[PDB]
Amino acid sequence: GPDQRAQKKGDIILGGLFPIHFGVAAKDQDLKSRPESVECIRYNFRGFRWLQAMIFAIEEINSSPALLPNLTLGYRIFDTCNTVSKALEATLSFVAQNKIDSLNLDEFCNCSEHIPSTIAVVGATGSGVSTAVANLLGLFYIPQVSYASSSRLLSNKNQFKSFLRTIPNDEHQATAMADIIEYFRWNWVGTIAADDDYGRPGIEKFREEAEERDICIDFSELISQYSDEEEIQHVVEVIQNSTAKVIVVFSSGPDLEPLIKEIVRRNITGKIWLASEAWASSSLIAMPQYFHVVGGTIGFALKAGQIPGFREFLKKVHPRKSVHNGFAKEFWEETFNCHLQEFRPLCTGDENISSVETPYIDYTHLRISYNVYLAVYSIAHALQDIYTCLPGRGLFTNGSCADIKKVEAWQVLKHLRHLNFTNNMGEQVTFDECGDLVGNYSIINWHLSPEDGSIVFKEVGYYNVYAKKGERLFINEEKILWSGFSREVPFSNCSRDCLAGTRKGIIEGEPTCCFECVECPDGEYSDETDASACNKCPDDFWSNENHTSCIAKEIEFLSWTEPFGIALTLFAVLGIFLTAFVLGVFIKFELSYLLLFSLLCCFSSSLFFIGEPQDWTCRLRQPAFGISFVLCISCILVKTNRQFLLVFLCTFMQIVICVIWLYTAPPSSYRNQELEDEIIFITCHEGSLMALGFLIGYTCLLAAICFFFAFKSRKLPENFNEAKFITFSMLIFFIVWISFIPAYASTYGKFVSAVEVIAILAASFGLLACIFFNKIYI
Amino acid sequence: GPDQRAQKKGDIILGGLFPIHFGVAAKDQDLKSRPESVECIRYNFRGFRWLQAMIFAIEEINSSPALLPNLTLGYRIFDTCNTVSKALEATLSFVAQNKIDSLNLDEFCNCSEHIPSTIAVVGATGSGVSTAVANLLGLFYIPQVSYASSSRLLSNKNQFKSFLRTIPNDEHQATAMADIIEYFRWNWVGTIAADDDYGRPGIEKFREEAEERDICIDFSELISQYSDEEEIQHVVEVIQNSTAKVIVVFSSGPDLEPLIKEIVRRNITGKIWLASEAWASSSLIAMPQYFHVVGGTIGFALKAGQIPGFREFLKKVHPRKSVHNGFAKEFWEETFNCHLQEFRPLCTGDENISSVETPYIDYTHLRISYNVYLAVYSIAHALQDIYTCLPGRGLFTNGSCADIKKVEAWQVLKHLRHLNFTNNMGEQVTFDECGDLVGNYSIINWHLSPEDGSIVFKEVGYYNVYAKKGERLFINEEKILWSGFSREVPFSNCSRDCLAGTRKGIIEGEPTCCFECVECPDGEYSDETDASACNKCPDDFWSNENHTSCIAKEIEFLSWTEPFGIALTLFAVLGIFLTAFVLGVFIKFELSYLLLFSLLCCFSSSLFFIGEPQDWTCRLRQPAFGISFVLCISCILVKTNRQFLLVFLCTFMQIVICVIWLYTAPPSSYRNQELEDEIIFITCHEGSLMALGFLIGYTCLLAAICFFFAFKSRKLPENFNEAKFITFSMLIFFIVWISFIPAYASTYGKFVSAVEVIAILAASFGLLACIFFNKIYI
Ligand SMILES: *[C@@H]1O[C@H](CO)[C@@H](O[C@@H]2O[C@H](CO)[C@@H](O)[C@H](O)[C@H]2NC(C)=O)[C@H](O)[C@H]1NC(C)=O
Ligand SMILES: *[C@@H]1O[C@H](CO)[C@@H](O[C@@H]2O[C@H](CO)[C@@H](O)[C@H](O)[C@H]2NC(C)=O)[C@H](O)[C@H]1NC(C)=O
Ligand SMILES: *[C@@H]1O[C@H](CO)[C@@H](O[C@@H]2O[C@H](CO)[C@@H](O)[C@H](O)[C@H]2NC(C)=O)[C@H](O)[C@H]1NC(C)=O
Ligand SMILES: *[C@@H]1O[C@H](CO)[C@@H](O[C@@H]2O[C@H](CO)[C@@H](O)[C@H](O)[C@H]2NC(C)=O)[C@H](O)[C@H]1NC(C)=O
Ligand SMILES: N[C@@H](Cc1c[nH]c2ccccc12)C(=O)O
Ligand SMILES: N[C@@H](Cc1c[nH]c2ccccc12)C(=O)O
Ligand SMILES: *[C@@H]1O[C@H](CO)[C@@H](O)[C@H](O)[C@H]1NC(C)=O
Ligand SMILES: *[C@@H]1O[C@H](CO)[C@@H](O)[C@H](O)[C@H]1NC(C)=O
Ligand SMILES: *[C@@H]1O[C@H](CO)[C@@H](O)[C@H](O)[C@H]1NC(C)=O
Ligand SMILES: *[C@@H]1O[C@H](CO)[C@@H](O)[C@H](O)[C@H]1NC(C)=O
Ligand SMILES: *[C@@H]1O[C@H](CO)[C@@H](O)[C@H](O)[C@H]1NC(C)=O
Ligand SMILES: *[C@@H]1O[C@H](CO)[C@@H](O)[C@H](O)[C@H]1NC(C)=O
């Protein structure tokens, strides 16, 4: 190892593993000369104060005699600047005295220094570093306690048997990560993890919860602090080639830094951020030059801790007082940008500690330092439980304890598996077989000190864990500033929630977070804006133009009080009045009475076939044939071959045909539906041929009888050409009955029945005129 | 470490890592007492002879002075019974003297033993074990040479910098694994890998090649030697719940053993096997009790090797000669099932070596032992190149070599990166930056010694690697015995290659290895048995009943020589003969000549409208109207009001109407298509109303003229009721022309034209009879 160490002697050595530099240099060895270790060129003041938080509690235990009397404590602490290489290079020296059973060819000085073996060890930050170092110490059962390693792979106790945490596991952070977008009500998001044991398994767990809550994922990407610049530009083009305003960033501190500088050069705005706790308080990331594109940044953190005298101990520093710190002189030079020696100028070693801005001392809270501060205490308190072994009631076979002068790491781990004691601020730190405890999380926003631009972290709520699901989370939303200032919550669903008129269809391949919306046709009336399917209307309605609630009814094919038909009804009334005047002339000055009365009935027949149709109004078309067949009695009575009341021989035949037809054909108005929107009509639905047979048996039978009896009398003037007038009236009635047929066969609705009505009225008026006017006016 | 070691002193220590036991015991430590290492209860004679192959070549280098004179060689070899735990427990003692710069608190005896550091080390078998141990030695650049670790993760030189192989990599085995089922012509298979660094990445590479060659995968499963018995039953139920006769097993030796015993209890047969080379020669697996369900087992292996004196050295064994072997006495007791000491009886230490069946000595070839035997030599030959450093032309800065008494592992690795020398049997072992070489593979079958039942491994070909793709592989298939004895190659496609009549459709979700097949309808004629889609027929064909090549033609609606129409044509000929007899009587004993001639033309008119239709045969229906209008001249000439040659006044009108119609309507036979299979007809397609207008203007005009001229003469007998006969003939012709209309309007094809033909013939025959017979017979 180097001189870069932290070591004081003592009865039991502890040692620790700490990131004094974020990034390592990455030189390529070439084997032409003697290879050597690599200097790691970055810094972490938070790591240096983590060292201070270690050694302060160390000296607390040494000074306090209530905590392990007659026992000075050693340590041999090394820097692991985020490489498993130097982590292994350190921990091989940790597995040293236990290798005396393996390396025993040093017999002449095998107990010269007589070193106590490093009994336990404070772990390391990065999950990859801890998983690398855990496999070695699982062999010797040397208990290793991490403080920041927070991946669920280490919860396995098959491989990692000698591993404990003073930090909660990651499943609850994945749970709250699902629940925050649940409460924030989104379905469409893309995430970015780190390509190691911290990012990948936790983002896999978040993928589990995302498909539990049916939240579709845009993308899942991986970066590191050694990522390729083309790959960073590639994933940035992936971001700009897609759309999800929220992003689950689930990485450590310095791994985002190249991507972050690249993005602030790329000047992408609008996308907002979700933070894992490994970078949710990242001072090197939290910079006001980056607060244009970061901000509104929501994350989690641990609760604060309290250490007495600690700020004073942090300013109890001096480079020629670093008898147990190799890193302190380099820290002094690096803070003061100079070159002390026993470009960069000299250093006086006497400057003010609280003079310059540094995250070493300009903190607000104690979280991971607090975890270390209680971690070394929990080691010491399990050790204290060994120190007061109950005489015969230890944690061994038969409770048979051993001495404290010869204590072994497996005994230490056995007592560490059952350690039931409480905090200095009164919290029972108690280990399950997951090797940790669990606490709550704060929930912050990256706000801004507006006059200074220092990115402040306002608590906007928290996440309890001690409740159950659907119950653990509370956010006061009333201090959230989305995109740093916008009070309104933004939009991150993929497809828009469409309006009322278009029902929400589905695209193949893409799930429910991004759909399509299609306006259904022809009776759509889709009322709700976000129902996936619409309904079809009932009978009395048709769709709106904007396909809203269908109210447009059907047709009104009745022509009852229609102005086109009312004038024809008035003309029929005038014809009836002319017939009344002719009968009044015939009365004042069988053919005289009944031929006039049956003609009046044939005139009044079609007037009972007008209006909105019904049962009786439908069956009243049979009297339009019967009264015309009765009015044809003059055509048989007034022939030149003129017992006269024997018109019953055809009247009863027509009546019997109608009595059969009343049960054969339908005497009921038939409301058909020909069109779609306006289709309400009435057409009476006669049976198959009943009306045609009755018409052929009455009308064109009596007219043909009159024509066959007057074919000889047409060339015969008698009673002032009354035979000529009768033949002309018979021809006119036959012409009207012939012309009414195709206009009934080629029509519909209110265009069909009016033709038959007007034709019957016209034929009656013509025959009545050609008889009565030529009779009377002379 | 234990006494279970292999150690002789020497100037440079080497050491190795070897599986003396397949499985370890898996006791759970409970920390109530002193924990300790676990005894591993299995054995591997192949591992023991691998130790022998190490130490024999070691003593060869020591005895040979041409190979490194004045240099005895140490070793410190340990057993790694397939656990990374004991592998690490070994290799911590390997990184020992290099830790003097780290552990320097042993100053009073830091050079007492003055141990030379273990300069290089022969690696280990299992890929997980080698990847575990490689990360440690990559730090110190101690070159480690494996011999069996064959995963492509170790081809990376970023992490594993100090790693070399004397075994080819796995990409070519995955390539040949794709090519063997390519040549064996399958598309549907399910695989089983081992759940570690050997199985998983290679089976991932095979998945790449499977989707390259478009070979769909049934399943990809993972087992170990610590698999769950319910999981083994679960994957066996997965096998029985699916179907693929070939199985890519891609694991080590003992990991299949629980699954294999479970399967031979489960008694699944029919499935055949593909072997990776890690178990393709697995003697503990190759058992005759298992050769019922295994057999036909195809795999790969390395070529054999040759070591002189080696069989004698293997039988140069004695337990009280094991001065550098801790495992040898246990090997002696384990072979002889006894208990030597200085139930199981005593051991004499003097039994015959070649007395019992054991895979220690009952081998056939040298493959991995050969790899070790050349591996230690390649270490020694790079060391020899260091020994004759060219004075100033080494592999350093300026070629500046160092001494052999103080040699470092980075110098050794530098010379190992450039080592260009040849085998004892003359093959240039030369390392690229993949840290290996590449050789061919044999391709075997697990045959049977039929009288002894020992599963013999007949070579059934090989796999060259030095060619390119599509070129590297040759199999003589003529010794393959599928399922151990069946000469025919079996079937493992998912869906069957269907017959000709059903075109191959596609199922959603499942790719081309498993499809559907559907018989297309209505002109299918799908000729090829394995074309995905069919075609539709040309016009002159319709489909077969079994939907094969469509040959069934269309209809023959001509009725030219039809027996139903030939009798009617003969009746028309008899009517023409009767007309000829009547004209002969009228000649022997205008109406006399032309009314007979035009009647003969009207008789012969329809006879030119019979047969298969054509242009002139289609236009010959106009003469059927013209000659009938000419034959109606008697109806105007023979009236009772009887200049006579003025029939031209209507003949020219009919001719001008026909001359207009010849250009108006189509004078061409119209082959319609009404049906589907048999639809070939002829219907002449007249224009819109031309034939109807010409018929109304000629036929029912002349007949109505005759009727209006004879309505008074019907009650007038003259010339023996010739007026009555003429009126009856006119009524008959009008009745025939009226009856021919609906039978033409409601028919088709050969049912329509024959009606008009027979009606014209009947009307002509009736009119000619009613004139001529009543004229002549009196
Ligand atoms: C974004 O989409 C989600 C679902 O994809 C919407 O959540 C639904 O909201 C409606 C009313 O807002 C609720 O009745 C549903 O129960 C919610 N879905 C689920 C699964 O609970 C969310 O409203 C959408 N937000 C925006 C702004 O479009
Ligand atoms: C973790 O969060 C919970 C929040 O549910 C805290 O519970 C509070 O406990 C105090 C003391 O009993 C109560 O007065 C509060 O009403 C609780 N808050 C609730 C119910 O919302 C709890 O203190 C937090 N810390 C720990 C260590 O459990
Ligand atoms: C199993 O299926 C494969 C393909 O899924 C078949 O291989 C095809 O065979 C035909 C003729 O046998 C060739 O014309 C094709 O070129 C082959 N396909 C490819 C992709 O090359 C194979 O014949 C099938 N075997 C059985 C027994 O069904
Ligand atoms: C690897 O396999 C190839 C097979 O392609 C072997 O090549 C043979 O080489 C000999 C010697 O030159 C020729 O006589 C043969 O005709 C080759 N076989 C062919 C072309 O099929 C080769 O020997 C094998 N071994 C090595 C180490 O390359
Ligand atoms: N939990 C992280 C370590 C970590 C937590 N907080 C951090 C802050 C900075 C750097 C690393 C961390 C891991 O598993 O790797
Ligand atoms: N290649 C194997 C090791 C191996 C090769 N052949 C073997 C035979 C038996 C056991 C193991 C092996 C691995 O990577 O793990
Ligand atoms: C970055 O985007 C913001 C958003 O409008 C814009 O105001 C600013 O000018 C941009 N800066 C650069 C350098 O493109
Ligand atoms: C009592 O203790 C001794 C030594 O600690 C041990 O050997 C013995 O098994 C124990 N007996 C019981 C019953 O625990
Ligand atoms: C031991 O743990 C239990 C858990 O409920 C707790 O009640 C008890 O107070 C603990 N004992 C001590 C001494 O703290
Ligand atoms: C195993 O299957 C074979 C295949 O037919 C059969 O002959 C044999 O009897 C079976 N054995 C058992 C134990 O089921
Ligand atoms: C020559 O060798 C010395 C020592 O080996 C070295 O320092 C020097 O750089 C070398 N010069 C060249 C040009 O290689
Ligand atoms: C070195 O390698 C080359 C590679 O082609 C070979 O030709 C040559 O023979 C090798 N040298 C020796 C000494 O074997």
Residue numbers in the entry:
A (entry chain A), B (entry chain B): 21 to 362, 391 to 637, 649 to 701, 724 to 859
What does the literature reporting this entry say, word for word?
The purified, Ca2+-free CaSR (EGTA-treated) protein samples were supplemented with excess L-Trp (10 mM) and subjected to cryo-EM. After extensive 3D classification, only one model with an overall resolution of 4.4 Å was obtained, showing a conformational homogeneity of CaSR in the presence of L-Trp. The 4.4 Å map allowed us to build a structural model of CaSR in complex with L-Trp (designated as CaSRTrp). In each subunit of dimeric CaSRTrp, one L-Trp molecule was clearly assigned according to the density in the map, which is located at the cleft between LB1 and LB2 of the VFT domain. In particular, structural alignment of a single subunit of CaSRTrp with that of CaSRIcc gave an RMSD value of 0.62 Å, and structural alignment of the single VFT domain derived from CaSRTrp and CaSRIcc gave an RMSD value of 0.41 Å. The structure of CaSRTrp illustrates that the binding of L-Trp induces a conformational conversion of the VFT domain from open to closed, pushing CaSR into an intermediate active state. The L-Trp-bound closed-closed conformation is therefore considered to be an intermediate state of CaSR during its activation. However, L-Trp is not able to induce TMD rotation and thus not able to activate the receptor.
